[PDB]
Nucleic acid binder design. Structure first.
Lengths: 33, 93, 46
RNA sequence: UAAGGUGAUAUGAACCGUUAUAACCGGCGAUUUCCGAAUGGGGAAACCCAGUGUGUUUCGACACACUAUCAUUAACUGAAU
RNA sequence: AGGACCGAACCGACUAAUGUUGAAAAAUUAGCGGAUGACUUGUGGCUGGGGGUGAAAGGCCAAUCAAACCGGGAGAUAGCU
RNA sequence: CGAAGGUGUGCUGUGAGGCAUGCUGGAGGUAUCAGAAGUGCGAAUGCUGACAUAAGUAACGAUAAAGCGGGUGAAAAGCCCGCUCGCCGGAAGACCAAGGGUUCCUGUCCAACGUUAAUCGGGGCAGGGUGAGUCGACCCCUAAGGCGAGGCCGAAAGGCGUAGUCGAUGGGAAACAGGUUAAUAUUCCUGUACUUGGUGUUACUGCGAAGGGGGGACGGAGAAGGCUAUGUUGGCCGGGCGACGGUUGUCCCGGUUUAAGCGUGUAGGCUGGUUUUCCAGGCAAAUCCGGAAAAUCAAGGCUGAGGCGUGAUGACGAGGCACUACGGUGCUGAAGCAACAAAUGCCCUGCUUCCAGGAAAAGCCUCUAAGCAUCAGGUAACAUCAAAUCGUACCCCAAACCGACACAGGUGGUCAGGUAGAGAAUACCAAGGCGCUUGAGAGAACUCGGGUGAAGGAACUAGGCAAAAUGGUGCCGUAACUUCGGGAGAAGGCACGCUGAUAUGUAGGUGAAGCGACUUGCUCGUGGAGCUGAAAUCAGUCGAAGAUACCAGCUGGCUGCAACU
C-alpha cells in the first residue's frame, strides 16, 4: 500500500581487513645472557 | 530605495507546511522561500510592493541542505533562506 | 586514555590552512605539487 | 548545414521546428558571481569591515565606479639648514 | 603562619590479584601518595631534527626516538641467505 | 550447417608431446617453412585473489535485578502500554562548551546493519524543524605572539625589525516574566521593559586632536559581620476518613508562587570639603592633573548588598468540570503567608595582613592646541527612523567528541534537594533518568570474586605476599631522644543507646508587640511573646553487644641510606 522500498541505501557493505603488531616480552624465556 | 528588478528577484516561492499554515492562521504570518542573499529590508519591500500588503516585521533563517544518496553518490542539497513575514492586518493568497 | 588527536578547528586552519600554505614559498610548492597531482582538496580548509 | 530537436544517467512531462529565423557546427562579439598574483584593509581561501566621489531617492536608503605594492618618468612643495 | 596536618574533588601512581586473540596496542578492581602548593587545569602562542626541550631517564618530541616523519639520490650496497 | 576455450575418452611416440572425436560453447582459429621471443613454476617467512582447517569450538563487552497481563504483527524474553521489582542520584539527573554535523521531530520499511530475534532502531528511505536591536558571533580595543611599507643585514633563497597591522584565552551599550509545536525560543506570542545612534525641531550654550591628566585596572592568604538563594516548622486553604487491631483527631495528604525594570535609599566600605591666589612639572598648553600657601566650614561627597513599594485587581496555582481520538484537549480556580536556620552566592575588585610585591589598551571622563567663529559644534527635552549579517535543530563525561568497534578508557565549565552525617566523604531516598541488544536450564571438576570456620597460630613463603586486625569523638595520660618546633593520636585507658527529671526546652541564638526618645524614619534604645536549640548531670530501662550499618589509624623497638617538601 505504502510501497516496499528497494533503494537499499546500505547494501554496499564492502568491508576490508586490518591488524596491529602487538607488544611482547621474551626476556625470561631467553636461554643465554 | 531598492530597485524593482531586485524586488522581482528576491522572492522565490511560498513555503507550504503545517507550521506555515498554523502561523498564518494564528499570528497572521506568511512564510516564504527567498533568495539566499536577501536581507530583511529587501524582503519587506518586495512583499509590500508585489503583494500590496502591509508588513509588520520580517524574521529570517538559513536552512541547511540535507545530504541524501542517489545510489552510491554522496550528494548534498543546496542551502536556502526562509522568511517569516508578519502582516499587519491584510489578507494574502 | 588521552590520544594524540585533539581536534580544534582554529589550530587546524592556522597550521595547515590555505592562507598558511600561501604565506611561505615552501607552502606554495606544497600547493603546486597537490595541484599537479590533481587533488580534489588542496588543503584542510573547508 | 539541416529534418529533426530541447547535454547525460533517465525517462517522462512540457514543448519547438519542417525551402526558411527548430536544433547543430565555424568565425566574430556581449554577459561573465565569489575566492585565488588578488590588488581598498584584514582574514581561520572563497568571508568580514570599508572609505571617497558621482548620481538617484517613494527618505528608509540605493546604485555605480575607484582606492595594493614596487620600479621608472614628469609635475608639485620641500626638513634639519 | 606553614613547598603544615587529616581528608573529598582534582592530580598522581607504591602493592596485590585479574586480564594476556583483553572491555583496553598498559586497563579494571581492592587498597596507596599528595591535596594552598616546586599545585593542578583550560585557551592561544613559542622553541625542529644532529635539532629542540629536559628537577636526568639516552626521557620526550603525534601508540616512532644512541637521533622523528615524508619524498628524492636509489634498482645504495650485501665475498651473505 | 559449429571457432577458440573447457570437460571427457581412445590412440600413438624415448620423452617433452601429438592426434582423433563425444559433450558444452558460440565466434573465431590456423598445416607448412622461415623469423622474433614479456617462451615453460611447487616451494623464494614469493605476490595477488578465492576457499579450507581448528569449528559449530571460544565468545556475545562490567554480576544495577526482574516478573506478569495485554496490544501489535505473519511472527514478541528484548517494541509499546499498564502493574509491581531492582539500580544512579554532587549522578547514570540536567545545562552547555570543544568537536561532530541533521544523528533532531515525524511517517514508512526490514534486505544490509544492530555480537540473538526484532514488529524496533542513532539502520535504510522520504518529508518537516533551527524565527533575535537586547543571547552570542561580527564588531571597539589590546596581551602572548605572528606579520610587517620603508629600513638594516643575508651567495640567491631569505633573516630581523620601525611606523604600523592583525591576534583572545581578557576589558567595551542594552529583556525579563507567563504561555507555544511532534519537534523553535530572553528569538514566536502576550504582558511588562531597557539600550545605542542618526535625523529634524525647540530652547539654551564654546566648541574643537594619532595631544595632556584621570579612569579602566587588577596578587595571595585569613578573619569577619550584614545578607540572600535554599530548606524546615507552624498557620492558612483545598480534600480525605482508611483491604487487618486501631485512627474526626496536636489525624492524614497536597497546595502555599510571582520577574526584569522602575522607584526608595541601608548593614557596610572609602575620601574631609569649599573658594581665592600662585607655579623651575605634564611634546606646547590648558581652566584637567601635579605642586605651594591662605581663608572658612569641618556636619561635604561617592560607593554599596539586601529589604521595601510598584510592576501585578495581572499571571500562575491544589484541585475540580466537561469533552474525547482516551492520545489528550478546553474551561474554571481555594489559600497563596509567617517564624527559625541559611551557603562554597552577594556586599566584596570590601577588610586585614603578607612577600614572592600583583597585564595592556579601548570604551569612558575631563583639559585645551591648530582651527572654527553672529556659523559650526555642544547640551537638554521632544518626536521620528534604524540596530544589518551570521549562528540558533540534536549530541555533548557520551552509542553524536577523542580511542578502528553502539569499545568497562579519556573529555573543560555550570547547578546541587531531603534524612542521618564535620562534610561536595558515606548510607538511603527526591526531581529526573535507567536495568547495561543474546537468552533458558542443570547446579560436575576446575577457575574467578566473596562469606564463614574446630584445636592450633607464621609452623607458610625468597620474604606476613595475601588475608585478618586497628579505626570515631570527648576526656585522662604518655617514653627515649631532640634541630626544642617535634617525637605524639606516642604507648596505654575510660565514657558512649533509649527514657524520665533538672528544664514535658535549660544555656545560648533569633527576635513580635509594647514603652519611650529624637537630629521623627529602611530610626534608636528599653523590653520581651513566640521560634530554634546544644552540652550535660542524676535516676531508671533493654539487648549478647550503643562510633550496633555504611564509614573509618594496627602498634612498639633496633640499624643502613637519602636532610626535608
Amino acid at each position: 500500500a505504502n510501497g516496499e522500498d528497494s533503494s537499499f541505501g546500505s547494501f554496499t557493505f564492502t568491508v576490508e581487513l586490518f591488524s596491529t603488531p602487538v607488544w611482547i616480552w621474551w626476556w625470561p624465556r631467553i636461554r643465554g645472557p | 530605495m531598492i530597485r524593482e528588478e531586485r524586488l522581482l528577484k528576491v522572492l522565490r516561492a511560498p513555503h507550504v507546511s503545517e507550521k506555515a499554515s498554523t502561523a498564518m492562521e494564528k499570528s497572521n504570518t506568511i512564510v516564504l522561500k527567498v533568495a539566499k542573499d536577501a536581507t530583511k529590508a529587501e524582503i519587506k519591500a518586495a512583499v509590500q510592493k508585489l503583494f500590496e500588503v502591509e508588513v509588520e516585521v520580517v524574521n529570517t533563517l538559513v536552512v541547511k541542505g540535507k545530504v541524501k544518496r542517489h545510489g552510491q553518490r554522496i550528494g548534498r542539497r543546496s542551502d536556502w533562506k526562509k522568511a517569516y513575514v508578519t502582516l499587519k492586518e491584510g489578507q494574502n493568497l | 586514555m588521552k590520544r594524540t588527536f585533539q581536534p580544534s578547528v582554529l589550530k587546524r586552519n592556522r597550521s595547515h590552512g590555505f592562507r598558511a600554505r600561501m604565506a611561505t614559498k615552501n607552502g606554495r610548492q606544497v600547493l603546486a605539487r597537490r595541484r599537479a597531482k590533481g587533488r580534489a582538496r588542496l588543503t584542510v580548509s573547508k
